[PDB]
């Protein structure tokens, strides 16, 4: 998966989502997508944005992945 | 790692919620409604995974689970308003 | 600017610059394919107009180019032989590089 | 033969004190080994020499492994008493002809 | 930058033109500068950087 | 004065600046000053000396800046005791 491997600046998020994960040190796409909805919501400054922002790109939230990160 | 602090609520309806002995009696101190305590006992919980009292007719009584995070919280809410008077008495 | 040879030449890899010194000259036996440097050369880059596109990779990227052009030889296509002999003549005055 | 290293060697167009010929003419008489490999694929060898007089494959460190059918064959001449020749030769095996293009082009490592 | 123009035209000099803002023309364009140094659009034009 | 000040306040001393008191605090350089301005009406008396190039440390501010170091200790005391 070509998107897996890149940081979390491909998505245009907005300034108030694009500072959120940060605090917990979200570094890889594949990063945020191993975490779910049951948890993120935690966090304060999204449930009306992360959907269809990564819906557009052909990925969603609750996958579940090995081997990662692959280094 | 953010800290992720406990709210600056939960801690100060814990304190009145041992000396009052009782929960409705613990909300008319704090200006707010009993129902109030019970939304920040859990969100605190996240943190602690222990429950904080055990239920016991007309009484309140003390379990060693919460026992423990009694004694971290009395101390934030004195210095704090020990802070609050230092600036207002040194401004005025 | 008087010209110079050294083996810090941009835009060029350095897989292709294994075959030299630190003074940019290849080595003897050394064998070389049409296309290969066997000696860097860089003369002073004058002064280029900016066209209204590179303005903008230029301020996107940040590759500014320097007061360097490449110069240096290469050889020449088709020839694949081995290097058996390297004479660098200097002039009087002017310093002379290691290899020499 | 495939390739030889010599010790002191750059280009096969160099010399060697005490040696007759010249660097070519051994990678010539080299092609001409009837060397036989019985068990694996590819035979590194060792030559080591030193005095006067004609060298031949008898001077070769020679392997349990390794057959080499003319023994009288002559590969160089040693002039001076004090020459001493270091060459490492490398065997493979293979069929029909190969150039020294296609090794090359094919091995990318430096 | 003066594409497909004359000239090229400098802070004030669009200020004058849209609001005289003079520090947040300078974040439009940096903006503009991180939206095409996303790995989204900059994949071709990296290509272009031993010309 | 919120929890929420808490953690603006300690870091505005360590970062000579509020501007500079945003990558690690996970916010925008705006923020770190929304708390402030609150704190000069609950307690109400500055903390800092605001000028354009940076901040003179005050005596009442480091004071503060003190007790914010008491009330993280002890929250470490209870981290670690999760830990």
Redesign the interface.
């Known amino acids: 998966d070509p998107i897996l491997l890149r940081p979390v600046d491909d998505l245009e998020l907005t300034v108030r989502s694009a500072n959120c994960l940060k605090a917990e040190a979200i570094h890889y796409i594949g990063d945020l997508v191993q975490r779910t909805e049951v948890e993120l919501l935690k966090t304060p400054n999204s449930l009306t944005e992360i959907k269809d922002v990564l819906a557009s790109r052909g990925l969603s939230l609750g996958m579940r992945l090995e081997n990662w990160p692959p280094a | 790692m953010s800290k992720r602090l406990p709210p600056l609520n939960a801690l100060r309806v814990f304190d009145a919620a041992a000396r009052h002995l009782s929960f409705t009696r613990a909300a008319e101190e704090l200006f707010v409604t009993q129902a109030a305590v019970s939304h920040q006992i859990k969100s605190l919980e996240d943190f602690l995974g222990l429950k904080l009292f055990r239920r016991r007719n007309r009484s309140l009584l003390l379990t060693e689970e919460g026992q423990s995070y009694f004694l971290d919280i009395k101390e934030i809410f004195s210095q704090l308003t020990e802070a609050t008077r230092k600036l207002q008495a040194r401004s005025a | 600017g008087p010209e110079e040879i050294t083996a810090d030449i941009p835009n060029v890899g350095e897989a292709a610059l294994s075959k030299l010194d630190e003074s940019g000259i290849v080595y003897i036996g050394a064998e070389v394919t049409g296309g290969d440097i066997l000696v860097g050369k860089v003369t002073p880059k004058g002064e280029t107009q900016l066209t209204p596109e590179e303005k903008l990779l230029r301020a996107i990227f940040g590759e500014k180019a320097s007061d360097v052009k490449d110069s240096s030889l290469r050889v020449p296509n088709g020839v694949s032989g081995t290097v058996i002999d390297v004479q660098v003549f200097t002039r009087d005055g002017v310093e002379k590089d290691k290899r020499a | 033969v495939t390739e030889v290293e010599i010790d002191g060697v750059?280009?096969?167009?160099?010399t060697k004190e005490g040696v007759q010929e010249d660097i070519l003419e051994i990678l010539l008489n080299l092609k001409g080994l009837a060397v036989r490999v019985q068990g694996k694929d590819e035979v590194i060898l060792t030559l080591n020499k030193s005095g006067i007089g004609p060298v031949t494959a008898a001077d070769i460190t020679h392997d349990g492994d390794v057959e080499i059918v003319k023994p009288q064959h002559v590969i160089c001449h040693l002039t001076d008493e004090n020459a001493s020749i270091s060459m490492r030769i490398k065997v493979q095996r293979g069929r029909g002809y190969v150039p020294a293009?296609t090794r090359?082009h094919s091995e990318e490592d430096? | 930058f003066g594409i497909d123009m004359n000239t090229d035209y400098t802070l004030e000099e669009v200020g004058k033109q849209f609001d005289v803002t003079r520090e947040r023309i300078r974040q439009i364009e940096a903006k503009a500068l991180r939206k095409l140094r996303h790995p989204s659009r900059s994949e071709v034009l990296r290509s272009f950087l031993d010309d």
């Not at chain 4, 750059?10 to 160099?14: D, G, I, K, R, V």
């Open positions: 750059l280009h096969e167009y160099s293009s090359i430096e």
